[PDB]
Amino acid sequence: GEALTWGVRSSFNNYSGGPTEMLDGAKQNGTKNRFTFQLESVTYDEATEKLEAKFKGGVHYQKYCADEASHSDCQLDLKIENPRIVIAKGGSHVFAKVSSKKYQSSGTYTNDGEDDARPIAQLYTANATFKEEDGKVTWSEIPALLTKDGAEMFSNFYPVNSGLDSLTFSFDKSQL
Ligand code: HEM
């Protein structure tokens, strides 16, 4: 409860062997493919029908390290932190603070996670499960697709609109 559960992308966790480290209190399951980010805050504006939930914690993936024992000088170095979900009438998305080294380049893809023009995923709540009981709200198995920014974070290894892991989050009605 009071958390976001999301694995980002199943095949990416398999390719990378999962995050080299969990950041800022985020947790991971035993198989390193499902992450849990604690709820920082949640607001719902009735008139605009906009729900916004901010979570804490991050994942750091590293691969192709020149010093493999200490994970230093890694050609693949991806951080995804403080996920924020916006579920609204005009569109639903996942935003996050990202830093990702680009494939065959010195360029680093960055995203501060506070720019509404640069979401990393688009969310489709039409067929997701929604439950509210005993003051607890859970919105489960919400499908997610990669946006243009999300594709850039993965060095365009995936096309735009390719699938991501579905997400689940929960909060108490008292926190609204
Ligand atoms: C610079 C050296 C790199 C080499 C030699 C390399 C090699 C490969 C190979 C052989 C695959 C195919 C296996 C698979 O799809 O699981 C792959 C997949 C992938 N690579 Fe890397 N890669 C490099 C860097 C990067 C970087 C910098 C990124 C950026 C995030 C990246 C992201 C990906 C992604 C997203 C996939 C798809 C994995 C999946 O979902 O299965 N790669 N890479």
Residue numbers in the entry: 115 to 290
Please quote the authors directly.
C. diphtheriae secretes ChtA and HtaA hemophore proteins that bind ferric heme (hemin) via conserved region (CR) domains. The CR domains in ChtA and HtaA adopt related β-sandwich folds and coordinate hemin’s iron via conserved tyrosine residues that are located in helix α1 (Y129, Y49, or Y361, in ChtACR, HtaACR1, or HtaACR2, respectively). Their CR domains bind hemin via a conserved iron-tyrosyl coordination bond, but otherwise exhibit substantial differences in how they engage hemin, including how the axial tyrosine is stabilized and hemin’s metal is masked.
The ChtACR-hemin complex crystallized in the C2221 space group, and its structure was determined at 1.63 Å resolution using molecular replacement methods. Two copies of the complex are present in the asymmetric unit (ASU) and are well-defined by continuous electron density. ChtACR is composed of 11 β-strands that form a sandwich constructed from a long antiparallel β-sheet composed of the β2 and β5- β9a strands, and a shorter antiparallel β-sheet composed of strands β1, β4, β10, and β11. Hemin is nestled within a groove located near the end of the β-sandwich, partially ensconced between helices α1 and α2. This face of the hemin is also contacted by a “helper” tyrosine residue (Tyr178 within the β6-β7 loop), which is positioned to form hydrogen bonding interactions with the metal-coordinating Tyr129 residue. In particular, the phenyl ring of Phe271 (α2-β11 loop) is stacked over hemin’s C and D pyrrole groups limiting their solvent exposure.
